[PDB]
Structure 1
Amino acid sequence: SEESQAFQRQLTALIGYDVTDVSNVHDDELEFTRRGLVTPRMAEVASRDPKLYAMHPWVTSKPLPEYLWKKIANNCIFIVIHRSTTSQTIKVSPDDTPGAILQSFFTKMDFVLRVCGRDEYLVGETPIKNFQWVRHCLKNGEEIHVVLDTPPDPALDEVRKEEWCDRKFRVKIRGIDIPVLDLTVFVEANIQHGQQVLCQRRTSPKPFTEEVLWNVWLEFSIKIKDLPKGALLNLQIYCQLLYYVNLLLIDHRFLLRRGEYVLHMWQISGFNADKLTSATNPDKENSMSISILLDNHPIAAEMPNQLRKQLEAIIATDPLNPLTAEDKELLWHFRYESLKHPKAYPKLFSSVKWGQQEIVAKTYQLLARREVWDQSALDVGLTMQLLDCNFSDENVRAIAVQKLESLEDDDVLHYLLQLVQAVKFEPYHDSALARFLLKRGLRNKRIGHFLFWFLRSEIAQSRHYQQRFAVILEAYLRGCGTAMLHDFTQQVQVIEMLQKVTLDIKSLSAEKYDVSSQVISQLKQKLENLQNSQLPESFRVPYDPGLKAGALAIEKCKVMASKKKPLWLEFKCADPTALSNETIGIIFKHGDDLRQDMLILQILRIMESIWETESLDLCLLPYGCISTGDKIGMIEIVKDATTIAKIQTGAFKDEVLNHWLKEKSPTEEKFQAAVERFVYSCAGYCVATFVLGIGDRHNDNIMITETGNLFHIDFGHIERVPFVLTPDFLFVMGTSGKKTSPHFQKFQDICVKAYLALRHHTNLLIILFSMMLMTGMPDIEYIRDALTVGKNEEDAKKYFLDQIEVCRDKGWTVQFNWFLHLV
């Protein structure tokens, strides 16, 4: 088809990468995958309920926390329906349906209830208490506003028609070269399974010249028949490590990899997921390469008491605790006793000799008897553990994915970023994991939307994985539907337009922080310019797809007075039934790796949900934030928010935050409401902060809302202090120096509960952390020590309370020091 090519060109624009391109490839794993993924797309496409697919209700099954019950303790809920001019209020039970609500409305005196100002719908057989919008309003003291109108046509979701032996192992190393570069140098070759080195050989070292030829067969200890699926041949270059590259020994059709390869290699920055990729370096003209030859096809009682004790001990340990040789032989010998314990599984499967066919066969036999796994309650931290870089067996990874099926869409969103990054640890482009993302994204539009940007964030920035992630995007976009394709297109254009301006603004003053409004005159011109004949009438807010944004409030846009020169932008909201005028605020910023900011924010969200599970609410404020490309993207602007900094030559007054709060609080009520929140918000930011290692912060980077909510910003690259709890904060808590106050006693009390609530999920956190570093940064011990592993709840409460007081001793000391250390 001719028009099927316009489609493929529309898909390339949206992706920012071309998936038909075979210039940087050496087999067909990508194309085979493009093709393999059709089945699962089509099936979930052919499977999803058109109506609910259009209206994408954002629903949960989790109970309501006691803290939103106390916000409505009379079995009643007020919803307000809107005609066009007129409205009418309604009184409702938290267990009503939107089905049932309407009825009482019509029967008071076909159509559907939609949130005011937002694309967001109250529909489906769910009790109104279980809608997130609703729960957002209750937490926010806000009243629900809704608008009775037509269902969105499910034709708007239409999907285009698609069309489509015992010989030891060896490798010859012919040589290396690079146009430009002198120590000595050798090639180390590694047979790798899940970070585990199975066998290793080196070359002789020879002098580093632009072309280096060895002509040497490298014989390893392993038999061909014993190489396992997912084995990487890992080629490295030392002198010590300068370059690396990887190749799959067994391919996506289970064929032993044969032949001549010339492989363009990656270089080291001056251990993380980039070191694992089977992608070759695209920059063919400047990169180091290496020439290789492969010519190696069929592939395919009781327990004593003290031992069980030792055994269970090992299972009790944390992820990061390494296993002895004895521990592994122990796990593997009573592997059937081990299988009974699903927490054991990671330890057990990293206690397998992946280097032996008979064992591996045994391990498959053992995964057949899986019934205890399959019946266990879904433990996500356990499940994630089996998808990190320590696992590279398809069958082990697949039982982890299986566990994920039972997640509802609401949980998926909590884990989506980190599940998207765990695609970096799969050995083959077509994983169970990828198909799970595909499927879930297609099943639900909210998932699909974030799925898009998560993939595009990396596709647009990582040469190590763009090709893989692109194949997967294409596969999503090819099932998401015309209305969302349209949308994604509006959104991409806008983003593209707005980076041009961000970058161009920057190079008009390198660091003369005084933003002369001569610099601000041009911003205005480029925006109006963009307006009249370029910039789409309206577009979805990427970090909050409920909102559709309209036209730039050009007067309210500025450039911020930073080291970089990020854009402060305010838009009009495109929805007419919006119940307010407040502009939608966005910061576009070149200069920070916002991928890392996404990751920290996302954990932050996980922690709330944790805390939710024990009826705590720390009023974290994890703002929207998306990496769009290389060191560039968007950040959500919180309304009525200011820097602790600005509330103050390194001089720091104590009272001024409380004064600031009282001068923004009209009633005395609202001021106490504000001090309450500040304690909660603060307590939460301090705990989370501590756990992750990002509490030593300058005042620039901590803000507070007019309404008392404190929040940290900008997770750039992170004497000392465990968190920021300065005198200004203490002042507000009505205490100073050595004495105490009820507000401080409360804050201490709240920190404690917050901390060990988190410690009830020590493994989950430890994983997400370790994954974050491997896939988000360019060591982990910190966190385990900060979570105080293996301690009774008292030891811990004591620890964290000592921490509180470290900041008390210090006080301004550190804050001061940033200034001092400027000069």
Structure 2
Amino acid sequence: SQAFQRQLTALIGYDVTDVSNVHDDELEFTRRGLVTPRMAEVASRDPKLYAMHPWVTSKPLPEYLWKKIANNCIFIVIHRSTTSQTIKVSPDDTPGAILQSDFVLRVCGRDEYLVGETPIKNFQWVRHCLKNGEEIHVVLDTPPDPALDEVRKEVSLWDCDRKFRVKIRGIDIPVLDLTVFVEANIQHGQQVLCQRRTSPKPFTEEVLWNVWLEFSIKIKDLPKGALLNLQIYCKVQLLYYVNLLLIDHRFLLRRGEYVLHMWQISSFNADKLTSATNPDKENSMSISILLDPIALPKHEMPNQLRKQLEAIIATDPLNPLTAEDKELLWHFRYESLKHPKAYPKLFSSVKWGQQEIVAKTYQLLARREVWDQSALDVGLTMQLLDCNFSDENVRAIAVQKLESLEDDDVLHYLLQLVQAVKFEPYHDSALARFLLKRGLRNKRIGHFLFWFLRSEIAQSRHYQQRFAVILEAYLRGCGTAMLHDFTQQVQVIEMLQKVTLDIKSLSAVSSQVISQLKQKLENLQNSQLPESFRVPYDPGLKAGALAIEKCKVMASKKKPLWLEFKCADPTALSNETIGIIFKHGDDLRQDMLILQILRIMESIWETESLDLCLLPYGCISTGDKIGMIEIVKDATTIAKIQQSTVGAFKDEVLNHWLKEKSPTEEKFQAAVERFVYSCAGYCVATFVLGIGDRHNDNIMITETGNLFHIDFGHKERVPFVLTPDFLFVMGTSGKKTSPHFQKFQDICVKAYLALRHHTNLLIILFSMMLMTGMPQLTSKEDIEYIRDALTVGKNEEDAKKYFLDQIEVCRDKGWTVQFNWFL
């Protein structure tokens, strides 16, 4: 009975049933509350399509992938057992229309199927074969049994004019001179509604006050999701913070005694918002407070002015609203309501500390015919789920829009939707439930949901309880088959993690350890490494037996395991191993975010028939400074190409490294073409994200020319890497204009203005990136970089003049920054 809950725990990596670190029942309330959305989505999903999870897209096929087809014909090799016939098919042919031309077509080597009522041009696997120029090897197979996916069954607030007040009894710490004072903030979003300090006392390991801080706000004017934020300052400096939701999950005003264990500091940072209290009771500072059945209820213009308003609606998400701007938006409430783009600013004009105002806000929300009718803008939808909005109804209108996204687009934004849960005031939310049901409706979304949630639970004390509850809610309806898969995957990576860590210690980069490594690996082949497991970063591929011959450790400072496995699938029509790098040392939650932004940029370019052959490899964080990376085959760093032929830099090297790895001049030109696309993409992307000034041992190239940056987890400068050896391949010497170098420039400018057609989307994604995954780089100035980088305000023409100049700044500096590193 209860051994299943213990199964869920080791799967989750946290004990959801625990109550050692709560001061109310919100987490347990959210467990009981999430049962409905689960049972709905479980009961409504097609068990057969759920079992085969056909990964399909409704987008148009781009112009570049069109001209790779031979007129309404595609070859599709079907396999029986030994023999295999090869059919002509029309892009618009359904999987059924190919079958006649029950059983089901499965892709060879993978747990991936081609089924359902969409044309074969709308399966991603077929767009993957078309992109790389490969042949669609399917295999007539029996459908997988839906039995296998079975699930194991289971006084009014507005009548109170009293000013709100909180008694600060004191703070205690078991171990620490200066003086110290508590600051108590009533908050809503990042907005501070009302502030009150204590008098400064001496900072001993206990400090009492017994003081009532009376706030100017009234109990009736407190809005749901209002945080009492408590902060300890000691010329001042913030040392410890904690929060407490003044209005609870039942809409009740929060009463009584609280001893809250606080978080230390090492600033817009998503950790500063959490309702969680420090679980480390022994080392942590605590504060002691007192609050004293009060429940919350629930319910044309001048020409010049129109222009001023439209000018405000037209500005970027990061452009600050003045009081003048706000008062304008609010007064012309119903004109602002006509423009979906105004909504973020409009709701940033609301005075949330004033009952009557919020009342009118909810009135205005009831008349949102234009919003509901508008075309989904993820950019706009994202802004309403960020840290500037803590109102359920505002945030629910955002989650409304997300409902319309096809599964393929959920996948695109899943990581950042998951991180958006860090900005929710309450454990139960539209957003959490949206993630929950979309995860249970689709095994691919659910797979990655599981890892994304698990990444955070494993290493964020600030949010591991919330995500833990949401994860359990997923696990209790995913199906017995997936529970078994996750259990496998967790077991496998726990083994491999141990091996990785133990081996890191054994050096201060010797090759005598190589045998000690291959020892542990060989001696883990039998117990308890299973004979198959899903690759967590690509749930298509199952991996079976190791290849202990090929497994190595790097001449490095962090000794990552280069591992390779055999594919457990016999129908796999290839000899390629599945490669995985296990690394400790870097925090890969930053690499996940950057890589996901990269895939987002690709799909953007897809809307403008552009392709820049980015290589955003799989990467999954799994624990404290530890995770896996997909191995990109046939690849090497730009530094090693220099260190082999020089040991100290030279221009030529790259080109005859390419040419030597190109078998026929035929292909070699396909490589240098690939290099111009790849190079431009990574220059565009890295300038925008402000991670372009990289040290060439962090940039890689395949044997087919594809360039790609790596290790994103990390004087005079350079906006991106466009070194002479890159230029050499293009065919330009100091100052020239090669046929390819102009094409590079051409692509860069096309791609750069292409990103700018989604400024808002990128701004919001980038802001969220910094706030939820990168604790160090979180200030207005840090965030506003991407405004500058995207040259907000500037016209397309000036923007091209801006980017091309940047290219020149790199040209101007050649090898400087690269060399300057060695010092």
Q: Tell me the TM-score normalized by structure 1.
A: 0.97
User: Which moves more between the two structures, 533-542 or 233-242?
Assistant: 533-542
Change (3 A) 1:419 1:695: same
- The separation in 1 between residues aligned to 2:290 and 2:755, in whole angstroms, is 52
1:717 deviation in Å? 2.5
Deviations 1:518-558 (A, max 9, x none): 21111111111111121111100000000000111001101
The equivalent residue for 1:815 is 818
- The answer as to whether partners of 1:254 and 1:300 remain within 8 angstroms in 2 is no
The equivalent residue for 2:197 is 202
| Structure 1 residues without counterparts, runs of 5 or longer | 105-109
Deviations 1:256-303 (A, max 9, x none): 0000000000000191000000001000011000000000xxx44920
The equivalent residue for 1:136 is 128
Taking only aligned residues, the RMSD between alpha carbons, in angstroms, comes to: 1.8
Change (3 A) 1:301 1:28: closer
Deviations 1:669-717 (A, max 9, x none): 1000011110001110100010000110111110001000000001122
- The answer as to whether partners of 2:197 and 2:213 remain within 8 angstroms in 1 is yes
- The separation in 1 between residues aligned to 2:393 and 2:611, in whole angstroms, is 39
- The answer as to whether partners of 2:299 and 2:362 remain within 8 angstroms in 1 is no
- The separation in 1 between residues aligned to 2:209 and 2:298, in whole angstroms, is 34
- The separation in 2 between residues aligned to 1:82 and 1:364, in whole angstroms, is 60
- The answer as to whether partners of 1:693 and 1:718 remain within 8 angstroms in 2 is no
- The answer as to whether partners of 1:81 and 1:148 remain within 8 angstroms in 2 is yes
Deviations 1:456-491 (A, max 9, x none): 000000000000000000000001001110000000
The equivalent residue for 2:778 is none
1:791 deviation in Å? 1.2
Deviations 1:622-667 (A, max 9, x none): 00000000000000100101111111x8711111111011111111
Deviations 1:141-197 (A, max 9, x none): 1111110010001101000011x9000000000000101012110000000000000
Deviations 1:284-343 (A, max 9, x none): 011000000000xxx449200000000000000001000000111000000000000000
State the SS of the aligned residue for 2:21.
Answer: coil
- The separation in 1 between residues aligned to 2:744 and 2:497, in whole angstroms, is 42
Deviations 1:549-572 (A, max 9, x none): 011100110111111111010111
Change (3 A) 1:360 1:645: same
Amino-acid identity (%): 99
1:369 deviation in Å? 0.4
- The answer as to whether partners of 2:51 and 2:144 remain within 8 angstroms in 1 is yes
Question: Structure 2 matches for 1:448-467, cutoff 5 A?
Answer: 448-467=446-465
Deviations 1:362-416 (A, max 9, x none): 0000000000000000000000000000000000000000000000000000000
State the SS of the aligned residue for 2:143.
Answer: coil
Q: Tell me, yes or no, if structure 1 residue 32 matches structure 2 residue 29.
A: yes
Change (3 A) 1:278 1:73: same
1:236 deviation in Å? 0.1
Change (3 A) 1:527 1:652: same
State the SS of the aligned residue for 1:114.
Answer: strand
1:517 deviation in Å? 2.0
- The separation in 2 between residues aligned to 1:579 and 1:748, in whole angstroms, is 40
- The separation in 2 between residues aligned to 1:405 and 1:645, in whole angstroms, is 47
State the SS of the aligned residue for 1:571.
Answer: strand
Change (3 A) 1:443 1:718: farther
1:582 deviation in Å? 1.1
- The answer as to whether partners of 1:67 and 1:616 remain within 8 angstroms in 2 is yes
The equivalent residue for 2:557 is 563
The equivalent residue for 1:805 is 808
- The separation in 1 between residues aligned to 2:345 and 2:73, in whole angstroms, is 50
1:87 deviation in Å? 0.6
- The separation in 2 between residues aligned to 1:813 and 1:318, in whole angstroms, is 36
1:100 deviation in Å? 0.7
Deviations 1:15-44 (A, max 9, x none): 000010011000000000000000000000
Deviations 1:185-217 (A, max 9, x none): 000000000000000000000000000000000
Q: Tell me, yes or no, if structure 1 residue 174 matches structure 2 residue 177.
A: no
State the SS of the aligned residue for 1:470.
Answer: helix
1:718 deviation in Å? 16
1:73 deviation in Å? 3.9
Deviations 1:772-806 (A, max 9, x none): 00001121111100000011111000010001111
Q: Tell me, yes or no, if structure 1 residue 215 matches structure 2 residue 213.
A: no
- The answer as to whether partners of 2:262 and 2:286 remain within 8 angstroms in 1 is yes
Q: Tell me, yes or no, if structure 1 residue 529 matches structure 2 residue 523.
A: yes
- The answer as to whether partners of 2:182 and 2:230 remain within 8 angstroms in 1 is yes
- The answer as to whether partners of 1:702 and 1:710 remain within 8 angstroms in 2 is yes
The equivalent residue for 1:355 is 353
Change (3 A) 1:282 1:253: same
- The separation in 1 between residues aligned to 2:792 and 2:702, in whole angstroms, is 35
- The answer as to whether partners of 2:696 and 2:818 remain within 8 angstroms in 1 is yes
Change (3 A) 1:59 1:217: same
User: Which moves more between the two structures, 123-132 or 69-78?
Assistant: 69-78
- The answer as to whether partners of 1:156 and 1:483 remain within 8 angstroms in 2 is yes
The equivalent residue for 1:705 is 702
- The separation in 2 between residues aligned to 1:541 and 1:650, in whole angstroms, is 37
User: Which moves more between the two structures, 579-588 or 600-609?
Assistant: 579-588
The equivalent residue for 1:493 is 491
- The separation in 1 between residues aligned to 2:759 and 2:359, in whole angstroms, is 33
- The answer as to whether partners of 1:487 and 1:539 remain within 8 angstroms in 2 is yes
- The answer as to whether partners of 2:586 and 2:714 remain within 8 angstroms in 1 is no
Deviations 1:592-645 (A, max 9, x none): 010000000000000000000000000000000000000000001001011111
Deviations 1:571-598 (A, max 9, x none): 1111011111111111000000100000
The equivalent residue for 1:257 is 254
- The answer as to whether partners of 1:650 and 1:816 remain within 8 angstroms in 2 is no
Q: Tell me the TM-score normalized by structure 2.
A: 0.97
Change (3 A) 1:159 1:317: same
- The separation in 1 between residues aligned to 2:526 and 2:628, in whole angstroms, is 23
User: Which moves more between the two structures, 515-524 or 571-580?
Assistant: 515-524
- The separation in 2 between residues aligned to 1:251 and 1:347, in whole angstroms, is 27
- The answer as to whether partners of 1:641 and 1:706 remain within 8 angstroms in 2 is yes
| Structure 2 residues without counterparts, runs of 5 or longer | 776-781
- The answer as to whether partners of 1:81 and 1:147 remain within 8 angstroms in 2 is yes
- The answer as to whether partners of 2:730 and 2:740 remain within 8 angstroms in 1 is yes
Q: List structure 1 runs of 4+ shifted beyond 6 angstroms.
A: none
- The separation in 2 between residues aligned to 1:214 and 1:314, in whole angstroms, is 46
Question: Structure 2 matches for 1:353-432, cutoff 5 A?
Answer: 353-432=351-430
Change (3 A) 1:633 1:608: same
1:6 deviation in Å? 1.2
- The answer as to whether partners of 2:619 and 2:627 remain within 8 angstroms in 1 is yes
- The answer as to whether partners of 2:299 and 2:359 remain within 8 angstroms in 1 is no
User: Which moves more between the two structures, 299-308 or 45-54?
Assistant: 299-308
